[PDB]
């Protein structure tokens, strides 16, 4: 962990030095791979700080754990038990952690400097767009639009926006997907939530497994968790997934929640985004089993 | 005899309490699923969309899920899909409809529609900008008008007797609401499209068996006599069948506030 402080360190001194090279100038070459070479070796003490403390917890536990499993149970109870269980499952996990970490602090303080086209409503630009269609005095060309405003409008017509909200949608779901493959769901939610999307601020919730504490007799009435219906939920995500008509960025956001490797894979265009979609997919599908 | 009965400890009034609320919303379905069969029989093939609200109104989300994947209707489908915990959507729909109403968006929407998210974000009125107003819970029966109150009303975390209250609070005159739900009647009475029009010598209105046991569970010194008597029950004034059995089952509860003349009568 002091090894990982002091790899960090460096490697935030040689960002600092590389952010006021003037581009093109060949002498920041060798500090451009010491800045590569610096952050690899940190994420890789990152990753043996997790995976070799696991391996020894579990040879000091495994002479011990009889367990029961309750046959009241809910989901989310089989996994906190799997997650005790199983150490492949365990291990792969504490892989997708790692790779999302990795994520989260290329993203780092830059969440709010995102400037869109619409500012005031959800695809501002087309509503404003059929709003003077509305009006008696339209003399303009007539485009081929949607001329409804729920969230599916664009595939059950198959009908564009204007190009504006076209460029919103595409730069916000790219947005969306990055937040999600650094872990910050809650923040790819607060982004829906931010830029007027309050129905898919809700989807990036129907993974949550399920729970009722007071199946088993608690003593205040305990909140209900999760998602009943989460089977269901997962095969509506992959026919999100699977139709042509949806953004990669859209399928790989319900994939990367639904185990569609094959409509993720799509989208990972580093070696950790490869082996991210590998390891995201493998936990789910195994959790799934 | 089944789940309370699992426990081989003295069950908490907690666990009471919400087994109580468990099987409530089974039979609040149970009331509901012949109409709601008989309405998507014929709703189905002209209107998907209130299809979809009827099945909703007998907590058949499965069901209006998928009529929903079948009609190409797949962005409500998900919708419903999540709609059994997390009030996160609740609210998120609650702030999709303000902004619609506030926008003049609102009325370029199905009000059948606005019906269903006004229904999923816990609003039994919706004021539209036209000035229209969709009540969620008009032209429905008094059974799956209280369902609409222990379900989409309320949390998880409520008694029935909230639902009940809330249900009573919808159907009476105050000095700053409209009514909006329809008042509890005897099966023999419903769709008879009988206003009661205040009468005159009558100052208890008639209601359903159902709803009195409903508020001497809500309220332990609540009425026995409006109970017992054959015209919460039957459309018969000399039919005592239930009503001897109902207080010899009451009696055997230690409900104790009936009066002798009152059992006298039902006894003779």
């Known amino acids: ?289 | 005899l089944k789940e309370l009965d699992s426990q081989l400890n003295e069950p908490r009034e907690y666990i009471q309490i919400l087994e109580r609320r468990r099987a409530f919303s089974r039979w609040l379905s149970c009331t509901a699923t012949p109409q709601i069969e008989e309405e998507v029989s014929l709703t189905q093939k002209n209107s998907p969309v209130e299809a979809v609200f009827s099945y909703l109104t007998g907590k058949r989300i499965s069901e209006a899920c998928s009529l929903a994947q079948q009609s190409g209707d797949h962005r409500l489908a998900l919708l419903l899909s999540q709609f059994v915990g997390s009030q996160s959507v609740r609210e998120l729909l609650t702030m999709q409809l303000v902004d619609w109403h506030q926008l003049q968006a609102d009325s370029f929407i199905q009000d059948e529609r606005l019906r269903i998210f006004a229904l999923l974000a816990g609003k039994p009125v919706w004021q539209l900008s036209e000035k229209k107003q969709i009540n969620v819970c008009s032209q429905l029966d008094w059974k799956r008008s209280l369902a609409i109150h222990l379900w989409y009303l309320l949390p998880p975390t409520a008694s029935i007797s909230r639902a009940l209250s809330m249900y009573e609070e919808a159907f009476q005159n105050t000095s700053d609401s409209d009514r909006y739900a329809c008042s509890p009647l005897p099966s023999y009475l419903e769709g008879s499209g009988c206003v009661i029009a205040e009468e005159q010598n009558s100052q208890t209105p008639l209601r359903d068996v159902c709803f009195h046991l409903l508020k001497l569970y809500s309220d332990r010194h609540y009425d026995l006599n409006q109970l017992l008597e054959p015209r919460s029950i039957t459309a018969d004034p000399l039919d005592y069948r239930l009503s001897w059995h109902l207080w010899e089952v009451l009696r055997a509860l230690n409900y104790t506030h009936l009066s002798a003349q009152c059992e006298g009568v039902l006894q003779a």
């Open chain 1, 1 to 289: 962990e002091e090894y990982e402080n002091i790899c960090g360190s460096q490697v935030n001194i040689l960002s600092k030095i590389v952010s006021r090279a003037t581009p093109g100038l060949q002498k920041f070459s060798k500090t451009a791979s010491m800045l590569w070479l610096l952050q690899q070796e940190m994420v890789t003490w990152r990753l043996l700080a997790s995976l070799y403390r696991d391996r020894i917890q579990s040879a000091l536990e495994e002479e011990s754990v009889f367990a029961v499993t309750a046959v009241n149970a809910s989901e989310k109870t089989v996994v906190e038990a799997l997650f005790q269980r199983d150490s492949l499952v365990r291990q792969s996990q504490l892989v997708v952690d790692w790779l999302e970490s990795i994520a989260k602090d290329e993203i780092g303080e830059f969440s709010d400097n995102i400037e869109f086209y619409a500012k005031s409503v959800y695809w501002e630009n087309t509503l404003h767009t059929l709003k003077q269609r509305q009006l008696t005095s339209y003399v303009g060309s007539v485009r081929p639009l949607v001329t409804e405003l729920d969230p599916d409008a664009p595939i059950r017509q198959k009908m564009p926006l204007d190009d504006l909200d076209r460029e919103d949608e595409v730069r916000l779901l790219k947005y969306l997907f990055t937040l999600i493959r650094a872990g910050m769901t809650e923040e790819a939610q607060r982004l829906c939530k931010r830029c007027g999307q309050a129905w898919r601020a809700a989807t990036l919730e129907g993974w949550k497994l399920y729970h009722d504490p007071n199946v088993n007799g608690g003593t205040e009435l305990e909140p209900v968790e999760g998602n009943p219906y989460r089977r269901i939920w997962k095969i509506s995500c992959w026919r999100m997934a699977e139709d042509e008509l949806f953004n990669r960025y859209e399928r790989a956001i319900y994939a990367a929640l639904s185990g569609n490797l094959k409509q993720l894979l799509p989208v990972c265009d580093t070696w950790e985004d490869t082996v991210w979609a590998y390891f995201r997919v493998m936990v789910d599908s195994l959790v799934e089993q």
